[PDB]
Point group: C11
Chain length 69, copies 11
């Protein structure tokens, strides 16, 4: 039942990086998206922070935001 | 528990479920032909969903479109 | 207490297909609706995704969408 | 639990409960004559409901009509 | 747990409760005469409610009328 | 738990509690005279309420009026 | 739990609590003089509240007025 | 758990807690002088609150004013 | 659990927490000077809060203003 | 669980966490330079937060501004 | 559990997590370069978040901007 974010890649090679939940913080996975693909990604037991690199249109419960490459 | 609506706008749209857990990889790909709709939840096994291909998508945060 | 989808068949032979919950994903049931019949179907312990094939008017909590045969 | 309102607009409308669980079959059909209203929940035993015949239906997602 | 409001618009209206559980049958029918109102929940014993006769009904999904 | 508000619009209005459970019968009838208000919950013992006599009624679903 | 606000519009208004349980009787009568306000919950002991006398009442369902 | 806001509009206003339980009696009377504000919850010990004297009151149901 | 916002509008404002339980008395008085904001919850130990002095107050029920002696 | 946002409008804004429990004193002070933002929850150890210095503050009840 | 969205408006923005509990200290500083977006929860380990550097911030209370150094 956690929140989720919507990431639409606006160019090739966007990275959606999950950061580890817990006392330690590191990248545990980078999912690479190509232009026009959409990832819908939850917060989870393993992921408590999500970093987006590259150009993407993003939706979350607080509205739209855009990352730039 | 949340769900995503996916409407295929062309043949071969691929809805890809990513594994929940410490590891991340795809565990299922459900292909849709033009005009079919898939309403898919997040689950004990799927904590992220990727859409490839042209599709019209509804989530609780609104509509979004994938481009194939 | 789970969410549900309303499906109204707009032609004969519409299939509402339930996909299994869990590590295994497959179709476990396909409900045939003929023109003008309505099915209101929940997500369940056994059904964690629902596929609609054929021409149908669908309502979810996200609004209306239409499937095309 | 959510519920659905079905108002029959002709005689012989059927409101059909489908079994919860790994098996899916009809377990009951409640017949409604014109102008009767049935207000029916989802339950431990009923995880999908089908309506046949002409009726005005209300759910949390709005009005829909079934036609015979 | 949710409830239904029924107002009888004529004499003889029946508000009928249907059993929760694997089996479905009527376990009670409450008769309403004209102008009487019944407010009735879903319960451990009642998972569906049928209205027969002319009445004004309100639920969470809005108004509907039986005839 | 939900409640209903009843304002008696004439003397002798009866607000009648119906028993929760397998059995359905009246366990109590509260008499209201004109201009009296009763605000009454659903409870462990009361799972349906009946109003007889002229009254103004509010519930979560809005206003309704019973007539004598 | 839900609560009701009652403002006495004249002297000697009674806000009466009816017992929760199989039995229904008055357990307490709170007298309000003109202009006093009582804000009163539903509780383990009180599952219905009756107002006698002229008062302005607010509940989650909006305003209603009891009259002498 | 809810609360009520009381602003005293003159000296000597009393905000009175009534005991939760089978018994209803006062328990505490908080004196507010003019301009003072008390923001008071419903609690394990208090299930009804009376205001005596001139005060501006806010609850989840809106504004109401007591008069001395 | 709910909280109240209090902004002091002059020096020497007191936000007083009253004890939760059968006993009612002041257990703490927090002094605020002009311009300072206190955001205080209701808690296991505080079930009523009194404000003495000129202050601008927000709660879930809206704005109210205390006036000093 | 609730949180406040604090934006420092000058150097040396002081966000002060008060200890949760029968005792009240501050257990931590986080200073912010001009333009920095702190987003801080109510927690097991903090049940009141004081802001000293010029800051722009957002909470669930709207915007408020501390002045130094 | 709540999250905040942070979009860096210049290079070298820091998103800093403060420890939950009786002890308060920084336990992690996530550097964002311009145009990158971080969506970060409150967690069992982070009960406060500080942003330093020019960034556009969304929370459930709306938009706020941090201003750089
Ligand atoms: N296996 C990952 C999948 C995931 C969810 N959200 C993510 C965000 C970024 C990267 C991976 C993910 C997890 O359960 O946490
Ligand atoms: N058996 C899968 C079915 C599923 C649900 N949502 C999905 C999204 C994509 C692919 C598969 C799925 C599950 O329970 O997780
Ligand atoms: N027996 C199935 C019935 C069902 C509910 N929703 C469905 C959607 C599609 C197909 C079947 C169903 C279940 O409980 O899961
Ligand atoms: N005994 C059935 C009654 C029922 C509830 N909703 C229904 C919908 C359709 C048909 C029967 C029902 C059950 O509890 O599940
Ligand atoms: N002793 C009754 C009181 C009651 C509550 N709501 C009612 C409606 C009608 C008649 C009595 C009541 C009970 O707890 O159920
Ligand atoms: N004893 C019944 C009373 C009841 C509640 N709602 C109803 C609707 C119709 C008939 C009876 C009822 C029950 O608790 O279930
Ligand atoms: N001791 C009573 C106090 C009370 C609350 N609400 C009331 C309404 C009317 C009369 C008394 C009360 C109780 O806990 O129930
Ligand atoms: N010790 C009292 C404090 C209190 C809260 N609300 C009140 C209203 C009126 C008087 C006292 C109170 C209690 O916890 O109940
Ligand atoms: N130690 C106190 C801190 C506090 C919270 N809210 C207050 C209101 C007024 C005075 C003190 C407080 C408590 O946990 O209760
Ligand atoms: N491992 C950290 C990750 C994190 C979440 N939100 C943060 C905010 C700032 C810094 C780190 C984080 C945690 O679970 O708490
Ligand atoms: N360790 C502190 C961190 C904190 C959260 N909110 C605060 C507000 C002010 C000062 C410190 C804090 C705690 O978890 O409580």
């Amino acid at each position: 039942n956690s929140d989720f974010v919507v990431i639409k890649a606006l160019e090739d090679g966007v990275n959606v990086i999950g950061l580890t939940r817990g006392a330690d913080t590191r990248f545990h996975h980078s999912e690479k998206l190509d232009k026009g693909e959409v990832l819908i990604a939850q917060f989870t037991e393993h992921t408590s922070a999500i970093k987006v690199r590259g150009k993407a249109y993003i939706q979350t419960r607080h509205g739209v935001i855009e990352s730039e490459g």
